[PDB]
Design a protein around this ligand. Structure first.
Ligand code: HEM
Ligand SMILES: CC(C)(C(=O)c1cccnc1)c1cccnc1
Length: 405
């Protein structure tokens, strides 16, 4: 299902990429997207899939478009257009200077000082989850750790019932890796039905949870509205439920396959932080975009006002012009260059939270379960979308090689 090419698009710029179902999926999701950086592919292409849109393929263009909010607006950041259209999260569907005030609040809730406060719980939950898995010699990493770990910390931050996990996660999943079961707007509405009552309750009777702070915050000297709060919280939810969750499984899947990488971390733990950035570069997973606010000529291509452009965060660090041997994991690269957490005004506020969760997991898993591998005859499947994922990650190990702490 290719849409007829608009008049302004030179046929030589066509490259029919399906962000939802790339061709090489079997080879891995990052590998499937990297096809866009092959020699035969222009720097800026048009795809007729998902209704027709541009895709910038190089770290340089992505960062440029990201910096340029005058031309490239966050107003309609999702493809297909109907999704970008229905998209109304804050601060994400706003451009500076408006974005700034909401960002400042969102920072209050997820920023550094919060992580610093949550640290012991993060470490507590990791250790507990791992210890519980250890003696089994086998899990479903995706369902066994990658989901509970980051989710439960979020649920704690947000003050929401663990019981709501399944329902929330389903809906979150519909936004980033649509099934066909529901449209973005339906998914969005349903999360909204969830939130409303909660916000109301927390405007009346404030807690110390993230939702309470958001619901009662100040923006531009006045009180946030209910609708604004509902709209920030919607973003926070997706961030908590759908980001770190997917990242951990790619990393884990790599670790399962590379004994030498595991060992390196065990003997030279001072390398963990460096390793985490490298894994963030290699297993980068997000791809959203922007809308053209006007006609504009960008690197010699004419973009028409209203044109959508996918600026895959994923691709910057995979770009050879940016990283030598991009597909190779090397914990000792002189310069790890990525835009995994975005670029420009929308740089991810939850990055601090995500790094703390990644580092704790590596340190804590390796400690207890130094030696593991993918289950025999398990075929690992990746999934593409706004946020890519791993479908299931069967791991096996000998309990006898584990260490209890
Ligand atoms: C692997 C982990 C994550 C990755 C790769 C990631 C990636 C991103 C990206 C690329 C953006 C910018 C989107 C744009 O420019 O349209 C973003 C924004 C944002 N992320 Fe993260 N995210 C992650 C985890 C988190 C977590 C755990 C939270 C907190 C619950 C969070 C909260 C935010 C917020 C609030 C924004 C909006 C900032 C603004 O619009 O000013 N993210 N994230
Ligand atoms: C692409 C993006 C920004 C994403 O991956 C994300 C979501 C919340 C926090 N951090 C990143 C996203 C995903 C789903 C809904 N809105 C935004």
């Amino acid at each position: 299902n290719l849409a007829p090419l608009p008049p302004h698009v030179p046929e030589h710029l066509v490259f029919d990429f399906d962000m939802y179902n790339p061709s090489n999926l079997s080879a891995g999701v990052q590998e499937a997207w990297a096809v866009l950086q092959e020699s035969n592919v222009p720097d800026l292409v048009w795809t007729r899939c998902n209704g027709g849109h541009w895709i910038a393929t190089r770290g340089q263009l992505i960062r440029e478009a990201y910096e340029d909010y005058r031309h490239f607006s966050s107003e309609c950041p999702f493809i297909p257009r109907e999704a970008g259209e229905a998209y109304d999260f804050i601060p994400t569907s706003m451009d500076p200077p408006e974005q700034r005030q909401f960002r400042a609040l969102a920072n209050q809730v997820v920023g550094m000082p919060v992580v610093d406060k949550l640290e012991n719980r993060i470490q507590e939950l990791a250790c507990s989850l791992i210890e519980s898995l250890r003696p089994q010699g086998q899990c479903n990493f995706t369902e066994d750790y990658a989901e509970p770990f980051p989710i439960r910390i979020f649920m704690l931050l947000a003050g929401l019932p663990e019981e709501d996990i399944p329902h929330l996660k389903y809906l979150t999943d519909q936004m980033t890796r649509p099934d066909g079961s529901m449209t973005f707007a339906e998914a969005k509405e349903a999360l909204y039905d969830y939130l409303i009552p909660i916000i109301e309750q927390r405007r009346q009777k404030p807690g110390t949870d993230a939702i309470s702070i958001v619901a009662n915050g100040q923006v531009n000297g006045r009180p946030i509205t209910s609708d604004e709060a509902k709209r920030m919280c919607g973003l926070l939810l997706v961030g908590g439920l759908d980001t770190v969750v997917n990242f951990l499984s790619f990393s884990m899947e790599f670790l399962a396959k590379s004994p030498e990488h595991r060992q390196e971390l065990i003997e030279r733990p001072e390398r963990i932080p460096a390793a985490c950035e490298e894994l963030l570069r290699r297993f980068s997973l997000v791809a959203d975009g922007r809308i053209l606010t006007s006609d504009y000529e960008f690197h010699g291509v004419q973009l028409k006002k209203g044109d959508q452009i996918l600026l895959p965060q994923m691709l910057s660090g995979l770009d050879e012009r940016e990283n030598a041997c991009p597909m190779h994991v090397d914990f000792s690269r002189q310069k790890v260059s990525h835009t995994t957490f975005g670029h420009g005004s929308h740089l991810c506020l939850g990055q601090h939270l995500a790094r703390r969760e990644i580092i704790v997991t590596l340190k804590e898993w390796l400690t207890r379960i130094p030696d593991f591998s993918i289950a025999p005859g398990a075929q690992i499947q990746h999934k593409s979308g706004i946020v890519s994922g791993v479908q299931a990650l069967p791991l096996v190990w000998d309990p006898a090689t584990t260490k209890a702490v």
